[PDB]
Design an enzyme around this catalytic site. Sequence first.
Site, PDB file in Angstrom:
ATOM      1  N   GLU C 171      -3.581   5.574   1.342  1.00  0.00           N
ATOM      2  CA  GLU C 171      -3.522   6.146  -0.001  1.00  0.00           C
ATOM      3  C   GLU C 171      -2.082   6.253  -0.515  1.00  0.00           C
ATOM      4  OE1 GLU C 171      -6.098   9.824  -0.616  1.00  0.00           O
ATOM      5  OE2 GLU C 171      -7.269   8.119  -1.400  1.00  0.00           O
ATOM      6  N   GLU C 290     -13.153   4.750   1.961  1.00  0.00           N
ATOM      7  CA  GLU C 290     -13.624   6.124   1.720  1.00  0.00           C
ATOM      8  C   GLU C 290     -14.631   6.164   0.591  1.00  0.00           C
ATOM      9  OE1 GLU C 290     -10.443   9.054   1.256  1.00  0.00           O
ATOM     10  OE2 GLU C 290      -9.292   8.155   2.917  1.00  0.00           O
TER      11      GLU C 290
END
Lengths: 167, 497, 497
Positions: C171, C290
């Site tokens: 991320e 995710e």
Amino acid sequence: VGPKEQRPRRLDLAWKSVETNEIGLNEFMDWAKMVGAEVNMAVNLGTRGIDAARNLVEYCNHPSGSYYSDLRIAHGYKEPHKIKTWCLGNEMDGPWQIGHKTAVEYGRIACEAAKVMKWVDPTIELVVCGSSNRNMPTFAEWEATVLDHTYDHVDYISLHQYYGNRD
Amino acid sequence: KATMIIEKDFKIAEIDKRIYGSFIEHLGRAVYGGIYEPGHPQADENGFRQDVIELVKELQVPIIRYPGGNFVSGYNWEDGVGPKEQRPRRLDLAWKSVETNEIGLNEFMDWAKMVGAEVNMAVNLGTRGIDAARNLVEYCNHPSGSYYSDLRIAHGYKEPHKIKTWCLGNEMDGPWQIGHKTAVEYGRIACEAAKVMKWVDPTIELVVCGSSNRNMPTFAEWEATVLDHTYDHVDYISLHQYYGNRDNDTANYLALSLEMDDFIRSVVAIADYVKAKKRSKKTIHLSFDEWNVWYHSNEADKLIEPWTVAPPLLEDIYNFEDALLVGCMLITLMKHADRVKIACLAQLVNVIAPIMTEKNGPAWKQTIYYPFMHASVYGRGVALHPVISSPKYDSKDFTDVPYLESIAVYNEEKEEVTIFAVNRDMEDALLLECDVRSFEDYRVIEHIVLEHDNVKQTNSAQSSPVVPHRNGDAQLSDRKVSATLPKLSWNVIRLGK
Amino acid sequence: KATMIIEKDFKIAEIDKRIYGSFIEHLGRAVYGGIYEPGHPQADENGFRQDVIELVKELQVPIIRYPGGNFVSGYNWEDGVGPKEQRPRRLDLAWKSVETNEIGLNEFMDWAKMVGAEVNMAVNLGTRGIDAARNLVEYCNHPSGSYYSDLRIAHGYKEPHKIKTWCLGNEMDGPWQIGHKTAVEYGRIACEAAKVMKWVDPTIELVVCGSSNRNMPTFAEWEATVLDHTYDHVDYISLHQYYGNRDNDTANYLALSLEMDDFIRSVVAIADYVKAKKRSKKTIHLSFDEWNVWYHSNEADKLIEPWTVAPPLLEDIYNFEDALLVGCMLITLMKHADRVKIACLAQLVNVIAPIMTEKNGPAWKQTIYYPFMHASVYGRGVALHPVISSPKYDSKDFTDVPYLESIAVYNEEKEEVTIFAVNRDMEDALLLECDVRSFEDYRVIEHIVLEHDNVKQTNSAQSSPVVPHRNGDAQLSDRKVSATLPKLSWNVIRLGK
């Protein structure tokens, strides 16, 4: 300017109107005189540029003995208008503006326009465009970049603001 | 043997008829000695060749791009309107010719009307910019009561042309282009031009320039940057592609449509990247606004001296295998009907063209005329998704090349289904079986075949050895179409009822 | 009423089983109190909870991402290996917890072996870089005879872990991320890390970070830049997405999978843009590494004081509508089996999880466990292209939402076809008719239904009101499967023979 029969009808894209040009700059100067106001004249830096800016200053401010000054005399205005303060375009940061320019593109053209205008008549003052309003995504960044490009050649930076009671 | 499922409910999209468009540039003999030849015995009252008019009409070309092409990037539209004695002679830097402007945009609109085509008008963003773009839209499309609209009326055209679809310049990425622009410079001017044009007439559509071809060093990067600058103001992005058999490898040549397929998919992907980056609800589609075989005439063109009027440039003489590849290219466009909405065979007359003319003499159909005509005439309706199983082959530049290139188009209004199919196999027939259980009460109308023993055989004014016949053997039995696709054949199987 | 054609020969792709993966981070009680709880009555000799191991095995999760997530961007892998006495207590700045490192990577690999999952190992590119990346690959994968491989041996792990698929950071676009990098900064470090990792072990695959969210201001631009820097050295690009029903609008909530579908299509487009820009023959695929519902526990987490060990963070308690949305998300992944090759339900235990535990107590199955289990167990094989005609509705954020979300998966080795179907309709049953002509001699095996009259009903350690039953009415008759899909239901219609 000049005889009304030779003035063209134009599509004004700003306000989606047909502009007859029955009033142009010399008639506006006549009106301004009657109300006791000087004129802060704006030059087109959207579809036009530095050549039109110098020629308009010359037409308005140079006494005589050149094509554009003698043209103004022929159009019925022997004495120059001697306009002091000029706007280098209008609201050039606006995505809704005709010939919108980025801050760099505008800074550069404004700088070069400022130079030629002042070479025609060094008594003038120039106003560079600020943001169209305080809410522009380029607010403050715009003014900084524009002044970085024009500082030594101009006198004022503009601000625009409108308010409303919508709630 | 190959199979196909032809299921009404497995659809790609309605075919936009503008995929059967074409293109005329002020290039060589496309205009002068092509559509327009005042000395010709078959010229009409306005100098247009009637024989050419009939040949174009038979193609049913819905839209024609004009006036360029490389020509437009140095062209002043005003030079081609108004009284002929005031039109200047210009040096066209694109093709090193003297352009007389005896034909300009109003005469071209008159010609287009006669052939039943709308015009996809290009604006100059090479030497010119946003002011000329708004003024040309105004001249063409605004009814009256302004200088430019009243000018068009004075020039003899009371009703506006009402041009729908416009090109924002031409091939601006090309180092050979007049007033070449980088992707940013082009994106910016195209955006500002698009705005003023749409403010004049918000009914129009705009096409932004893609890369000049898939091999440009700025390929894909260009399209992304240009769309980043123009997305909200434009409707289509263009692709250009030409092919040629410069190494005499037919197997590899006929596989080139797989590359066109990937080219299309790549440009679709770019549009959808930019859509997502902008969070836009609008989908940009593709205008494949130059495509053809082009190579045969390269060496002859090298001998043409500059500054003549209407030199014989780009006069490819097409052969049978060229027609097969054109057929594969057409099928490839149909299979992308969901995203390719306009396409232009470049070009329509004389210049890399399906129609050729001789001075004071006949007009004739090149080999490529036929598959183009069949696709245009029989390929209106909904493109269906084929689930083909076909044998395949490897070539120099391609792997797993299906021998079968095919698609079916369903026309609900005519109650017709048409199967276009190329067999690329250089030696054997292909036994095609189509599962048409989805279509009840249908029968075979006819099976058109274009074939010739010699892939290098051309047509000419004297004789046309490469022509379709209607002796294909397709037959429909218990909801299966069985057809024999000869070796190296273009096939059109028409079903009805 | 809705219809669906289930055509054997109209295929998307073989489903990669890794689309049924999951993810464990050092976050809250996912590890400590989740997979690992010394002294639990069900703990094994290594301290792993056997009850959790069985619940994970029943889900058949093939691959588990580890150890983060936001955690990994400030983590030093060496801190979690070797003798426990030499492992430091660290401040985890991602979740403001004290991490003891009592579990590190070798203990995680021991756990993963017990549930039959491979590990998708993430490397720190926040505070660390290419040297730590190569060294960790060496430690994990090089057999012996170098300092780091012999260190792993000395630590009790003679055979290399032989980790196949690695994440290049976590991320990295996120302003909340430790060592956040711009797309260019990240692209460059990921490129250089990728190179050294593959020089240690050329059998590995690498995943580069996408945007953390579809809503990021750098969305799409990020992926394009990152891939521009890494294309030739990497194999997948990640997407992350979470949903929630924060305005109590069920009809709008259940349509959110249409957004996920657009997000996937958008990222595929970006990969193909860059492929074309590079003229690469390699296709990059997606790791949706995710995804879940995440929102219930937001307010509770705000009360947690910093710097405890294993705080009860992200402990969403899911309800029935959440399971329906999870079902829609799974169908969305299957629908893109051609390009989504890995996906990770975030996360597997306690943290936004299908499996929840109590300390010294039971482990239980959340509502979302069921659709995930059904998808993983019955959704192996080839995803078929859905041809469906469904009625539709409009919601706050979406237009033309089909009441039916469905796909069929054909397992040719098992001779089974499984139809996954959600009926989003809040009032009416949907009568589904599936054309199964292409599956001769197939019959209905079973029709599983997950339904509950209250969408806000949850499960708990004390009772599970939201559980599947097998009273679905699907029936074969004349080559057509007809099934009633109750209002607001998840359905698994299994066919065989």
